[PDB]
Amino acid sequence: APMYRKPTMYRMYRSPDIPRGCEGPCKVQSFEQRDDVKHLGICKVISDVTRGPGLTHRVGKRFCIKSIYILGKIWLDETIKKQNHTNNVIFYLLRDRRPYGNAPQDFGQIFNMFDNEPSTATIFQVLRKFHATVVGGLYCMKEQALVKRFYRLNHHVTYNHQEAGKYENHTENALLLYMACTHASNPVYATLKIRIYF
Amino acid sequence: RSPDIPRGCEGPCKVQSFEQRDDVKHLGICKVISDVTRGPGLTHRVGKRFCIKSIYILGKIWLDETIKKQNHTNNVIFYLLRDRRPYGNAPQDFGQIFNMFDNEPSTATIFQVLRKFHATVVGGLYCMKEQALVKRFYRLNHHVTYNHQEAGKYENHTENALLLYMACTHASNPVYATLKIRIYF
Amino acid sequence: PQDFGQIFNMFDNEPSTATIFQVLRKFHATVVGGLYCMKEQALVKRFYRLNHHVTYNHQEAGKYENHTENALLLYMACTHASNPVYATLKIRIYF
Amino acid sequence: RSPDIPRGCEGPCKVQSFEQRDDVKHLGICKVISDVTRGPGLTHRVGKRFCIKSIYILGKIWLDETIKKQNHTNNVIFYLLRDRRPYGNAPQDFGQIFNMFDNEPSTATIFQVLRKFHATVVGGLYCMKEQALVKRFYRLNHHVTYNHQEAGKYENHTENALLLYMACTHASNPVYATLKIRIYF
Amino acid sequence: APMYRKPTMYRMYRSPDIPRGCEGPCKVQSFEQRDDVKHLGICKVISDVTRGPGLTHRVGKRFCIKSIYILGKIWLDETIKKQNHTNNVIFYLLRDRRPYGNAPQDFGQIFNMFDNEPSTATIFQVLRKFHATVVGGLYCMKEQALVKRFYRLNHHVTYNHQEAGKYENHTENALLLYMACTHASNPVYATLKIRIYF
Amino acid sequence: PDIPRGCEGPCKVQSFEQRDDVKHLGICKVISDVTRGPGLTHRVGKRFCIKSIYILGKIWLDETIKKQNHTNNVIFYLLRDRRPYGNAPQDFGQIFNMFDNEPSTATIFQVLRKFHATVVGGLYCMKEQALVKRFYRLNHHVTYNHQEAGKYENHTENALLLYMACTHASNPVYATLKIRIYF
């Protein structure tokens, strides 16, 4: 921001953002170049946002996430994983209510096998789901890398400790992702660009 | 928008000046301002301006050391003054207020006063009936400003400082007064 | 303003750091008299001492409380808890 | 009163940006400025102005890990650039300089250059004749300024930043280059 | 100083002080309300000067002491110490060449018994000496508390570490005091006000 | 026409070593064995003005072992010391960082210069071994504290000594140096 003094004045005014935070709706990417397994792909989307005056940071422990913008290409175009084929990807974007120390499991967290909801003793809240179907075997093979873009409006987040630190000092109203495969093979090489501007 | 005070949209941050101290008969001096230095952190300030919302004084005032049962029955009078300017360090108490231990500031010094308090610890022998008293007080106050633009100590202020003096009323020194002083602003 | 409420420390000192009042000079007078001689008593002190300007602000035909820049005055100090000193001084200012 | 440079009568203080790092083929990025934050201490600054007298680059550049004997014979080209302004963080190297690893800055980017260096570590098998080289260099330079008046990080500068890029010339990554970088000013 | 910015500008110019330091010739008292023994009264006169922007402090580790101004009243006027009487006080203001950790001894430091110089294996430098003779017994008793004031010009001092700390981090060109009694009794209650402005 | 101090003969006191080092430190107070005496391997009084240090030396690893864990180099350090503390102080706790460094910020000891020696010998050639280093190196004055005929323990201001440093966890370096000081 032009001429921090040390936080910005001339902010101070009308802007259609959110209730609590006031500043420039600063983007923090959580890019991944990753994959998953059948059981879990775990991504706390909030881990990189630490204390700083910069425009990929925060001031204090209070967020109001305006929107999560999920880019991503989900392929299996490695030279293997043409056998044991036809798998699909179900995305899960959950509104969490508290963290239990560090990042938790998934098959020990959501109720049943891969088409489910959170357990009855765990009500964590859900926001929405997605789909991605990559079906490629042999002799065509007709399907591969799909592109997914989504605007997705969301709401506020708070941290616990006063650290310029990692994901472990979260508190109430966390939010994160789970990715799920539906077959015993692991073809899915899903790399996602996740913009949060707030 | 803001309802705090007419200056700070800032987070109304607490900076506590805890003491584990005592006094003498003449003076117990406590500047309660340079606890805040300049910084981006949450026990700091931005710029050189305050509006102290309230001073919250906790404290236990005892004499329960194994000595100071003789020369007993002393009491503590607190003084919370609105200062108009310092020069150099904290000026000492009997070199600033007028008369012996039941007084006001001098006629050539008008520093302003806000309020007073009481604490009576009377313990001798064969009961001894009185000891450590607990004092809590909400106390609303107003603005403070520094002149010198340093991330520094107490010697460099301007208009409206404020600080404490503690006074004993007897030649012995039984009073071991430790006070927790929250300022959130 | 009273003396110990203005100068810094106990009886061998200077003005305080928050008070810089200026000093011109000092003097000495030692009267040591106990019993069985007693060898010392009344001492005589005369001193020329050149000085400079003084101004009042308030335009009254009046007392001392109403001055401005460059006042000047005296302080006398004893160094023991007894008070033997009966010091009577004749102070001429001609200007 | 004193001969240093046309700005600072200050103590010509050293702030060292030691690294125990490495690089990749594309980029090794090192802003050598936000080592200094605002402070009264002797590894800091007063205000928002520098005149860097000299950068003194120590460093040992090896590949003496038990791997990276195959895909061998790589060399290191150093780049010490005079920057004209940053925005946000340090912009990455191949997204800033023109062509593949023997180049200059792009035509749409004129950032200024000061000088280059060399370091050739060629070690394969059966001798293997070359390893850790030592490089020391006096290198006189000039002034640096911050815009944003924070006691803070690197993202908040103005005119005349300066930083380093390190470049490898082969697809393997053998280079474990650790450098001690004194700036006294 | 009026309007530190954060050290003072408009200093910058002609002032008859000393070579190295530039600022207001700031006073640091080392007042004592102390006494001595026959062997030693030890006073490192530099201990309180720590790092600070204030006018009883320093910037960096370099001094040029302009003058030491020694006030002091040296008495024996306690109700005891009229017997074993007639003692005198010899002052010693030494230019030290290095500290050995913390403050050292005196009878293990100066050569001989109470009328001496530093030892041949120790050449610490001397600046000057003083005298104070308090002779009081019974039936007059003719002498008591004497007043001593002295201008005494001196020169530069340096510290070792970069601490805002005590006397132990001194280096070359230290300077300190020793006070000496000349009789086995200890009547001397010497309290001294020691101004250093530099 | 050579000396700035006194018309004595520029007497040689040579601190030969047949030694080695470790990775952390090779410590050599070079002014150690200079005691009071009439000979030219001695001193008159307690005041020196070292004209030059002349460093000879062959730095090898040609023992039948230390062909593995190879390719190490030697960095020399010739420091102008400011103050002593009895015997010789630490190296790794005195100079700042790991083996490519300067003295620490709380220690400013002065430096004069550095040197290099690269002995890289493994197997199947092995191409490098014992190197010879000679250096004229002009320097300046040294003072002793006591008037004893003593060793390095009784120093004062303006000492000077050497540190040798290896850069690998093995210890191949068998560095023997002939160090002439004539003054």
Side-chain angles (χ1 to χ4, degrees), chain D residues 60, chain F residues 20-26 59 72-77 91 98-100 119 163-175:
Chain D
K60 181 170 70 178
Chain F
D20 56 351
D21 55 352
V22 298
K23 188 180 186 181
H24 296 284
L25 57 89
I59 299 95
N72 195 1
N73 51 3
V74 178
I75 299 171
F76 291 97
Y77 293 99
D91 179 74
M98 51 180 292
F99 308 105
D100 287 325
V119 283
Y163 292 109
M164 295 181 288
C166 297
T167 60
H168 289 85
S170 66
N171 194 3
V173 175
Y174 290 161

Side-chain angles (χ1 to χ4, degrees), chain C residues 14-78:
Chain C
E14 293 293 329
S16 297
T17 62
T19 60
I20 298 171
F21 293 159
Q22 293 182 357
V23 187
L24 291 174
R25 284 299 89 195
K26 296 181 182 180
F27 296 104
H28 292 285
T30 60
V31 283
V32 291
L35 292 175
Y36 293 98
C37 185
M38 63 287 197
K39 187 178 179 293
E40 275 295 328
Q41 285 297 324
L43 296 177
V44 180
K45 298 295 182 181
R46 71 270 182 94
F47 290 103
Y48 286 162
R49 184 66 177 87
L50 296 174
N51 287 316
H52 289 284
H53 62 279
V54 170
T55 302
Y56 293 8
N57 188 9
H58 298 86
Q59 299 175 355
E60 294 178 352
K63 291 183 181 179
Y64 58 91
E65 295 181 352
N66 59 7
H67 297 180
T68 182
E69 294 180 353
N70 285 320
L72 53 85
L73 61 93
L74 289 174
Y75 292 109
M76 295 181 288
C78 297

Side-chain angles (χ1 to χ4, degrees), chain F residues 72-138:
Chain F
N72 195 1
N73 51 3
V74 178
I75 299 171
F76 291 97
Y77 293 99
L78 197 151
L79 301 184
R80 185 176 178 180
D81 193 359
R82 298 294 296 166
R83 66 182 67 86
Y85 291 97
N87 53 4
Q90 296 178 357
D91 179 74
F92 185 76
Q94 191 270 329
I95 62 175
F96 185 75
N97 204 349
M98 51 180 292
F99 308 105
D100 287 325
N101 53 0
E102 293 293 329
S104 297
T105 62
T107 60
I108 298 171
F109 293 159
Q110 293 182 357
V111 187
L112 291 174
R113 284 299 89 195
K114 296 181 182 180
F115 296 104
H116 292 285
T118 60
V119 283
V120 291
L123 292 174
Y124 293 98
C125 185
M126 63 287 197
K127 187 178 179 293
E128 275 295 328
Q129 285 297 325
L131 296 177
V132 180
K133 298 295 182 181
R134 71 270 182 94
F135 290 103
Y136 286 162
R137 184 66 177 87
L138 296 174

